[PDB]
Amino acid sequence: EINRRVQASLASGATLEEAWSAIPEKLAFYDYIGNNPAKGGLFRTGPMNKGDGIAQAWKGHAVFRNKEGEELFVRRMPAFFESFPVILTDKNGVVKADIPFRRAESKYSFEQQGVTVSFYGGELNGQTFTDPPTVKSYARKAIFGEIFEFDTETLNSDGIFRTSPRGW
Amino acid sequence: KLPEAYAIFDPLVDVLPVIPVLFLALAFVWQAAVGFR
Amino acid sequence: ELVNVVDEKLGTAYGEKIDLNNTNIAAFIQYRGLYPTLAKLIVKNAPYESVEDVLNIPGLTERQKQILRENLEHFTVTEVETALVEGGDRYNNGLYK
Amino acid sequence: QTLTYDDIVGTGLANKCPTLDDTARGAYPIDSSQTYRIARLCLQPTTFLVKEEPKNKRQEAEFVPTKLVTRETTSLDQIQGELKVNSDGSLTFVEEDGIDFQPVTVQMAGGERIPLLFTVKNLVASTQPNVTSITTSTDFKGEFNVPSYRTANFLDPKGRGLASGYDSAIALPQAKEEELARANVKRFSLTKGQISLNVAKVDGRTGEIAGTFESEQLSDDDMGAHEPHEVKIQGVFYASIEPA
Amino acid sequence: GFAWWAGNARLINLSGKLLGAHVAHAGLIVFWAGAMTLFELAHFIPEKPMYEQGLILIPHIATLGWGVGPGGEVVDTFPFFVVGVVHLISSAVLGFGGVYHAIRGPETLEEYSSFFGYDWKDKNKMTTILGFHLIVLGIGALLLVAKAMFFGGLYDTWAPGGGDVRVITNPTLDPRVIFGYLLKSPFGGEGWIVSVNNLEDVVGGHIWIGLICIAGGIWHILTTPFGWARRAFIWSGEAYLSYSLGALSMMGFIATCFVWFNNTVYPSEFYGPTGPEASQAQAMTFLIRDQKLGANVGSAQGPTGLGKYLMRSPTGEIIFGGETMRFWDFRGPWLEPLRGPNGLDLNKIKNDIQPWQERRAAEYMTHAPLGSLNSVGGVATEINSVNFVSPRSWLATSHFVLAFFFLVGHLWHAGRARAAAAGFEKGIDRESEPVLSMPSLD
Amino acid sequence: QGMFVLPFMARLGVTGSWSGWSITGETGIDPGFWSFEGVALAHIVLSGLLFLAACW
Amino acid sequence: AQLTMIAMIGIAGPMIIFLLAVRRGNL
Amino acid sequence: AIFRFLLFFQGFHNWTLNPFHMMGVAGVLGGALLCAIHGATVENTLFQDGEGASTFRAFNPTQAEETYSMVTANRFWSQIFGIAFSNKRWLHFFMLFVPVTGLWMSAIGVVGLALNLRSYDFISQEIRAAEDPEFETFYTKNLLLNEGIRAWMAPQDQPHENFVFPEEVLPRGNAL
Amino acid sequence: AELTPEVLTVPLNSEGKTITLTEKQYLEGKRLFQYACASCHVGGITKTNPSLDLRTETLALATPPRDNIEGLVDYMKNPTTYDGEQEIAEVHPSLRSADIFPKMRNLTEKDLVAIAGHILVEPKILGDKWGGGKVYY
Numbered sequence A: 001e002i003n004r005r006v007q008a009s010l011a012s013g014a015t016l017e018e019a020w021s022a023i024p025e026k027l028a029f030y031d032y033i034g035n036n037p038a039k040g041g042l043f044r045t046g047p048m049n050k051g052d053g054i055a056q057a058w059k060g061h062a063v064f065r066n067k068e069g070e071e072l073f074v075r076r077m078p079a080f081f082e083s084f085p086v087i088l089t090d091k092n093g094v095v096k097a098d099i100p101f102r103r104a105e106s107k108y109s110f111e112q113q114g115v116t117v118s119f120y121g122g123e124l125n126g127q128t129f130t131d132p133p134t135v136k137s138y139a140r141k142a143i144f145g146e147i148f149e150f151d152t153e154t155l156n157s158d159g160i161f162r163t164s165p166r167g168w
Numbered sequence B: 001k002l003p004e005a006y007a008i009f010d011p012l013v014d015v016l017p018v019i020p021v022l023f024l025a026l027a028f029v030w031q032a033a034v035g036f037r
Numbered sequence C: 001e002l003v004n005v006v007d008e009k010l011g012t013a014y015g016e017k018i019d020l021n022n023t024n025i026a027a028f029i030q031y032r033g034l035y036p037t038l039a040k041l042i043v044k045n046a047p048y049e050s051v052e053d054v055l056n057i058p059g060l061t062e063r064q065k066q067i068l069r070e071n072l073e074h075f076t077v078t079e080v081e082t083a084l085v086e087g088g089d090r091y092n093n094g095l096y097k
Numbered sequence D: 001q002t003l004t005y006d007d008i009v010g011t012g013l014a015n016k017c018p019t020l021d022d023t024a025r026g027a028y029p030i031d032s033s034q035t036y037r038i039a040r041l042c043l044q045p046t047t048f049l050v051k052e053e054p055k056n057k058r059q060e061a062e063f064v065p066t067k068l069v070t071r072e073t074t075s076l077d078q079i080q081g082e083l084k085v086n087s088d089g090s091l092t093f094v095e096e097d098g099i100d101f102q103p104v105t106v107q108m109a110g111g112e113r114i115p116l117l118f119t120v121k122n123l124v125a126s127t128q129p130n131v132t133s134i135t136t137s138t139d140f141k142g143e144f145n146v147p148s149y150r151t152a153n154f155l156d157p158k159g160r161g162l163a164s165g166y167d168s169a170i171a172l173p174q175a176k177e178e179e180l181a182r183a184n185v186k187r188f189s190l191t192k193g194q195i196s197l198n199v200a201k202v203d204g205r206t207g208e209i210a211g212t213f214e215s216e217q218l219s220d221d222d223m224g225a226h227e228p229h230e231v232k233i234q235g236v237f238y239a240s241i242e243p244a
Numbered sequence E: 001g002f003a004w005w006a007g008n009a010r011l012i013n014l015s016g017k018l019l020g021a022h023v024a025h026a027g028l029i030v031f032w033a034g035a036m037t038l039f040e041l042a043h044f045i046p047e048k049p050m051y052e053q054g055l056i057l058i059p060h061i062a063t064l065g066w067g068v069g070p071g072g073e074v075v076d077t078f079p080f081f082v083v084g085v086v087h088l089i090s091s092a093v094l095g096f097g098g099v100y101h102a103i104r105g106p107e108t109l110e111e112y113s114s115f116f117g118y119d120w121k122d123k124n125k126m127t128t129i130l131g132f133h134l135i136v137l138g139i140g141a142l143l144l145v146a147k148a149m150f151f152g153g154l155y156d157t158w159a160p161g162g163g164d165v166r167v168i169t170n171p172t173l174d175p176r177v178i179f180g181y182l183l184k185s186p187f188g189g190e191g192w193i194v195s196v197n198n199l200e201d202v203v204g205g206h207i208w209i210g211l212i213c214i215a216g217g218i219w220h221i222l223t224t225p226f227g228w229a230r231r232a233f234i235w236s237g238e239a240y241l242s243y244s245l246g247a248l249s250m251m252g253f254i255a256t257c258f259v260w261f262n263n264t265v266y267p268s269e270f271y272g273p274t275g276p277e278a279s280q281a282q283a284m285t286f287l288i289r290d291q292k293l294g295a296n297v298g299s300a301q302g303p304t305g306l307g308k309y310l311m312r313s314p315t316g317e318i319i320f321g322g323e324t325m326r327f328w329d330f331r332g333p334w335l336e337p338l339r340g341p342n343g344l345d346l347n348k349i350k351n352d353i354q355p356w357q358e359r360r361a362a363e364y365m366t367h368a369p370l371g372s373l374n375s376v377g378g379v380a381t382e383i384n385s386v387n388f389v390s391p392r393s394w395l396a397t398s399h400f401v402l403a404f405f406f407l408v409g410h411l412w413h414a415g416r417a418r419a420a421a422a423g424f425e426k427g428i429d430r431e432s433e434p435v436l437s438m439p440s441l442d
Numbered sequence F: 001q002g003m004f005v006l007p008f009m010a011r012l013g014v015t016g017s018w019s020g021w022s023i024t025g026e027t028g029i030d031p032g033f034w035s036f037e038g039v040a041l042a043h044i045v046l047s048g049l050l051f052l053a054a055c056w
Numbered sequence G: 001a002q003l004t005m006i007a008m009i010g011i012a013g014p015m016i017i018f019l020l021a022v023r024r025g026n027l
Numbered sequence H: 001a002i003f004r005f006l007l008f009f010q011g012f013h014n015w016t017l018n019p020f021h022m023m024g025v026a027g028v029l030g031g032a033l034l035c036a037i038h039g040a041t042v043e044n045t046l047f048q049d050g051e052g053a054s055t056f057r058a059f060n061p062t063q064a065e066e067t068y069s070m071v072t073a074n075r076f077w078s079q080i081f082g083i084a085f086s087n088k089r090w091l092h093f094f095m096l097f098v099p100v101t102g103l104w105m106s107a108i109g110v111v112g113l114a115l116n117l118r119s120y121d122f123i124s125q126e127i128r129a130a131e132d133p134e135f136e137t138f139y140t141k142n143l144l145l146n147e148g149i150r151a152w153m154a155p156q157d158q159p160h161e162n163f164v165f166p167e168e169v170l171p172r173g174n175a176l
Numbered sequence I: 001a002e003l004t005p006e007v008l009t010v011p012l013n014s015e016g017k018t019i020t021l022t023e024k025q026y027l028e029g030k031r032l033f034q035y036a037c038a039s040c041h042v043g044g045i046t047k048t049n050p051s052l053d054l055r056t057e058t059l060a061l062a063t064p065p066r067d068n069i070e071g072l073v074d075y076m077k078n079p080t081t082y083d084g085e086q087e088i089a090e091v092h093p094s095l096r097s098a099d100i101f102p103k104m105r106n107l108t109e110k111d112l113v114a115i116a117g118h119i120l121v122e123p124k125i126l127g128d129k130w131g132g133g134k135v136y137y
């Protein structure tokens, strides 16, 4: 639905910034795995906010590109996986970047492929980041879907996903 | 390989090692023939 | 300020050529004529300030010199990275298949 | 006569350096036209002292004693290297190769374990000017290198490392990472240590020497996780010199 | 009163028929020994190591000096054939006496002849039979001595120049050596009797055992059990069976550890490398490869801070690094030339490693005793291709299983012999239930 | 530090712990059995034996 | 094949029971 | 295929850490214990009711009398183990109770896993380990194994997902 | 899919002559590879030196090129290091060293062609698995 809307905005001559800024934050927040009721644990108690925190703001839609200007796509985490690697694909599914485990024979590091992240909509709209460790930090969040700013201090959130009342 | 002049017996020797097992089986045929008395 | 220096190195020519000062010896198998014999010598005589220093390695025959010449373009040099050269890691970096 | 493996195995003697007779009070003359190597250098620690933390301003903590928990695994041995003669008659040993590190862990009072890489790697140790003979009063002083206790492939218990491993705390997917930066980013340290070797015994015939050493170096910093301790090692050494 | 499924217990007091069972069964053992040897021979291919071919009997014959030359190369297969044929032929004779005594002969012997007949409760007669068999056994251990000293020698993996058959001219008699082994700890670096590492000690140990068994045998013919032994034991056929099952069990467990750790009387040339050997050979292999590329294997620090190739054992000896730290007690002929007084000698490692040692390490590393039940070789994640399970894995696992069950049989027959001798093996008498005449516990 | 029984042990001469510290600040001390730990243990064992005496 | 010999050998044992049971013998 | 299901549940759900599985383990292993120990006891406190060395003949399914001594069995176990059964009815009910209850408990935990409601982690352990790289337990060691299981098996076990893991992203310790 | 002649066609020599093996030659090669080579070279890797494998592209870059029947037959007679600079008959099986590697004694010239052919065919059948190691099992 989000992609459907952004395309419809673009067809009508809106810019990237404008198409994504029109995305209501409420729709973007549904497109986030931390609200997936199948990401919890039996003894991870309390509200969802106790884990990833109290959501404050959509940061914006992250767009990754490599040094040749190709749009790259973070492979999303599936609900079965507690942890998941960071793999970036092109529109056709060909791996073009990842975060390597073994560094020594890596071909696809962000550092080698010149992966940047640019934000449209939300808090970081119009901002681009190019220093590799910042780019990697956002790609790590992008596997969860859309990227939000969270208040972790108020409830002393421990950072681990809990299930919703639907799950419980 | 066996010596040349016994080569004829090669397929017999492939089976010989198993023969002690057959003695165990044979005790159960015997006991079947007397009805496990 | 806390930076992973191995990741940082993949952002240099080390991440696209054989670095004569840092790269593990098994990389020299990617080009013809270099492994094991010249690979051995290149690693033993590192560090190099420029790629052409390798031609001034004592003992090179003229065939050996020729091989290096052909391959100078697959080579680079960056600053020695302690993390890549300690532990004998240029001879065995714990990666097999 | 000397001992075989089967006489030694299991005894503890394999960790002990060769000793000289207390009658070996000779002198080993040095000819500047000649070149010398050290065929075997052996360092056997006896005492591991760690510097405490006074927590206050003008007290400067003290070196305290520790217990060894890693057994007879501590000696450096089979070290070889150039022994040079300099313009001014000083001698400089340059370490080339050897079993020149051992990991050791000692335990401070209270139970804190302190691992260290006891080493002389890349040792360059020199004498005073004008030697001409090595005697029962010659001192070598030098410095050496202390690489990180773990090397770059080492993975911590959550799979994080420098040249391998995860780059984040994957069990805490949505934690704030700023707090964890120091544990998540591994760093490979490389510090210097110092050593004095004091020659107390000399076999003028054979070229063997023996005596006492003291070295100062840093302990393990667990790839940047925590601050090192300062360590002082005392022990005995043996070396045989050869016309190279 | 026994059912068909306990039907051989019907033989306990039929000494004639029981002699026939023992001798018929003796014939099956000898039959298997013969048939199996000929099977291995008909399959043997001398270009291939024995241990790539599933052989367990030919290795025992070669270990005795027959059929082999320097390095364990097979030079003559005729000795193997002879051993098979003679065992095969001899089993017909035992077969014959066996079924004659089980079917046709007198079913009890004590009426026919007071020498051959026996009562289980007759302690004098029982120790006499025991004595005779003790003498036979002593003779047998002396036949091994005779072979080693007077009829060609034994294969010696430690012989210089790759191993060879050697005549043993100075068998060890010093009892501090021979019985020193009995008193070594069974733990690592010690190995109780499994650590015997030279044929002089092997042969001398058998002189001692032969003399002890012959002396023991004569002792038991001439004496009857003392009163303290009379009161310690149960004196019944099933009790004696239970004693021997326990002894077979002990021996099966020892044989398991022998073929698994010992590479002297189970040479690795025939049996394949041991687990410790193979694992030591891996570290050797990559020490060689890496040093040839220029690595300084003595100064190379591994990920943990311990040496990548070389470290110290807990008592200081220089040993191979990695997980094989655990196998540093290993000793083998391909490795010992590198050992100095402090353990592995760094100057021999740098200068004196020989091609045959590089070959041997590579061979042993790629024939480690790891494999699947369907004989796919190597670690459990390996793909199909290599048809190999080490003979040592086969000989260790089989004999562990047999030793375990014979210990169960010991407990079975021991507890039953105790109960039958006291008269309550068939159950509790309702009218004299012991617990009903005991006071309650509380 | 809220220590209540530690000073009654210190008072009568128990000053060191099997972990090698002493309450006076000396490190590397061997207290033998009668450390803080060994005093605590003596009292546990004693409790259990008196528990058994009480049952009898 | 080998299936000839193990057939011949396999039948020996049972044929002994058969002969002895039809000739009413000491089974 | 069922073996693969075992290993899937280890790597993805950490099911061995689940106390509902643990109660199931106790009920199944407790059942087999009770089965063996009850059979062994009856057979070794038999009354001599015939004269044969085979004691099976000396039973008649319509006899009134118990065929083994509960009194002697009770004394044996009281002296061997501290406590024994004394009530034949309780005994046989408990043999029903133990394995039935264990299986019911394991069913409950699987219902949780239907939702990915796993007993996967201990939070307090993770907080410590994230901050303290010298802290290590068998609990952290087992999650490294789980993480290996997931990444090495998921591509071929979940083919509809088109997972492509380049070699460089596979978790691996040194050398292996 | 099947073992078509296209797949059984491999280079004979460096001059791009080809040769089309039979299904028979290929199965014989595979059998002979398991007999004499796979203890070290299972799946196209090298257990005692994993840095050198039997992938066609690796062999192509060996000195004497070994991505052809001739190179491989020669290799089995007189093996060299990967740069051709030294003969390694004494630590690598070969006809030249069949005194110390006795499995090589009974190998005929035709057997060597079949082994070489197997090695060159297999990566056409198995792709990345051939020489790729456990990642690809």
Ligand code: CLA
Binding pocket: A042, A043, A044, A045, A046, A047, A164, A165, A168
């Ligand atoms: C159908 C019942 C139900 C459901 C689905 C919910 C759902 C929820 N409650 Mg509510 N609640 C309920 C009943 C329920 N509640 C009742 C009855 C009470 C009164 C006790 C409360 C009191 C309550 C409070 C006070 C709070 C919640 C909160 C919450 C939320 C978090 C729950 C959580 O962390 O679970 C954790 C659950 C577990 C760890 C599972 C317990 C597993 C048990 C112990 C296993 C027992 C096994 C057994 C002993 C074995 C014996 C068998 C055999 C051997 C014989 C969630 C939306 C929290 C919240 O976010 O509110 C704003 C909160 O703070 N609830």
Ligand code: CLA
Binding pocket: B021, B024, E004, E005, E006, E007, E008, E009, E241, E245, E405, E406, E407, E408, E409, E410, E412, E413, E416
């Ligand atoms: C020297 C060894 C030895 C000897 C002479 C005996 C002798 C005896 N035993 Mg003891 N037994 C032994 C070892 C031995 N046992 C061991 C090692 C165990 C533990 C496993 C036992 C356990 C045991 C029990 C539990 C009992 C006896 C009993 C008896 C008596 C009757 C046995 C009988 O009729 O079997 C008849 C033979 C059979 C019923 C055949 C059994 C077949 C086995 C289980 C399977 C073997 C299959 C094989 C592994 C592979 C098959 C391949 C396939 C092609 C067929 C007899 C006095 C009985 C007794 O107490 O007598 C008073 C009794 O109840 N034995």
Ligand code: CLA
Binding pocket: B024, B027, B028, B030, B031, B037, E003, E004, E005, E006, E007, E008, E009, E010, E011, E014, E017, E018, E020, E021, E022, E024, E025, E092, E093, E094, E095, E096, E099, E102, E103, G016, G017, G020, G026, G027
């Ligand atoms: C090693 C195995 C072994 C051996 C040697 C014996 C031996 C014996 N058993 Mg035991 N038994 C065994 C296994 C064995 N048993 C097993 C596995 C079971 C369980 C099924 C039993 C169950 C059992 C019972 C129930 C009884 C015996 C009895 C007997 C004895 C008398 C049998 C008889 O009258 O045969 C009669 C059988 C025949 C006349 C048929 C022919 C048998 C022959 C010997 C076959 C041999 C063929 C061979 C190829 C010929 C080669 C000859 C050549 C060398 C010249 C005999 C000593 C009996 C006993 O104790 O008597 C009091 C008895 O009642 N056995």
Ligand code: CLA
Binding pocket: E019, E023, E093, E094, E096, E097, E098, E100, E101, E105, E106, E109, E112, E113, E116
């Ligand atoms: C230990 C096994 C054993 C035992 C205890 C017996 C015991 C007995 N048998 Mg039996 N028998 C056996 C094995 C055994 N036999 C074998 C293997 C065969 C087939 C060859 C026979 C065939 C047989 C027959 C046909 C008859 C007996 C009879 C007898 C009885 C009297 C024999 C006599 O007068 O001595 C005779 C003494 C001698 C001939 C002295 C010579 C010594 C021997 C033969 C040479 C030494 C052999 C050597 C130690 C081991 C083999 C060598 C090998 C390792 C290479 C006696 C109860 C008789 C009987 O029961 O009638 C009622 C009877 O008619 N036996």
Ligand code: CLA
Binding pocket: E127, E130, E134, E182, E183, E212, E213, E214, E215, E216, E217, E219, E220, E223, E224, E225, E226, E229, E232
């Ligand atoms: C098959 C072998 C065998 C068997 C079954 C017997 C059986 C018997 N012997 Mg004979 N004996 C044998 C061989 C054998 N002997 C030999 C070869 C000799 C010559 C040295 C003797 C010398 C001998 C003497 C001198 C005496 C006996 C006596 C006896 C009787 C009592 C045995 C006893 O209670 O020991 C059980 C053992 C003990 C009570 C104590 C010793 C326990 C050992 C040392 C502990 C070791 C356990 C350890 C885990 C095993 C590892 C090895 C160890 C060395 C470290 C019994 C009938 C006695 C008798 O009545 O004779 C008429 C007697 O006085 N035996």
Ligand code: HEC
Binding pocket: E362, E363, E366, I033, I036, I037, I038, I039, I040, I041, I046, I048, I049, I052, I053, I054, I058, I059, I062, I066, I072, I075, I076, I080, I081, I082, I088, I092, I093, I115
């Ligand atoms: C271990 C005992 C091996 C056996 C058995 C076989 N090979 Fe091997 N091979 C081995 C090593 C250690 C090496 C590297 C040699 C070096 O340069 O150091 C090799 C190499 C080869 C090659 C060359 C591979 C390349 O990329 O250039 C080939 C073609 C080869 N080996 C083939 C081969 C064959 C056909 C075998 C069976 C007869 C065989 N090898 C056995 C180790 C071992």
Ligand SMILES: CC1=C(/C=C/C(C)=C/C=C/C(C)=C/C=C/C=C(C)/C=C/C=C(C)/C=C/C2=C(C)CCCC2(C)C)C(C)(C)CCC1
Binding pocket: B006, B009, B012, B023, B026, B027, B030, E020, E021, E024, E025, E027, E028, E031, E085, E088, E089, E091, E092, E094, E095, E096, E098, E099, E102
């Ligand atoms: C009693 C009884 C029993 C048992 C039995 C037995 C166990 C028997 C044994 C028997 C036996 C144990 C037998 C044997 C036989 C043998 C034979 C008869 C042999 C022959 C041989 C030959 C003829 C040879 C030939 C040859 C040659 C010479 C060369 C090489 C080749 C060949 C091999 C061909 C039973 C249980 C069943 C039942 C009940 C009763």
Ligand SMILES: CC1=C(/C=C/C(C)=C/C=C/C(C)=C/C=C/C=C(C)/C=C/C=C(C)/C=C/C2=C(C)CCCC2(C)C)C(C)(C)CCC1
Binding pocket: E177, E178, E179, E181, E182, E193, E196, E201, E202, E203, E204, E205, E206, E208, E209, E232
């Ligand atoms: C050959 C050889 C050798 C030698 C050996 C020998 C010399 C041995 C001996 C051994 C022996 C010498 C053995 C021992 C035995 C013993 C035992 C095993 C015992 C047992 C016991 C018992 C069993 C008891 C019991 C009891 C009791 C306790 C109480 C009462 C009751 C009764 C009696 C039951 C050697 C090694 C050098 C080398 C190689 C070869």
Ligand SMILES: CC1=C(/C=C/C(C)=C/C=C/C(C)=C/C=C/C=C(C)/C=C/C=C(C)/C=C/C2=C(C)CCCC2(C)C)C(C)(C)CCC1
Binding pocket: B016, B019, B022, B023, B025, B026, B028, B029, B032, G009, G010, G011, G012, G013, G014
């Ligand atoms: C060496 C030799 C020989 C010898 C031989 C023999 C010695 C044989 C034997 C034989 C035998 C010894 C056989 C037997 C057989 C057996 C069998 C064939 C069996 C079967 C059985 C069955 C099949 C079973 C069934 C059943 C029953 C009966 C009941 C229960 C159930 C059942 C189903 C299990 C000859 C002469 C050839 C010559 C050459 C060489």
Ligand SMILES: CCCCCCCCCCCCCCCCCC(=O)O
Binding pocket: F031, F032, F033, F034
């Ligand atoms: C271990 C090194 C120190 C040696 C310990 C000295 C021996 C034990 C001394 C304990 C003295 C306390 C007893 C006080 C009197 C108690 C009298 C009583 O039981 O009523």
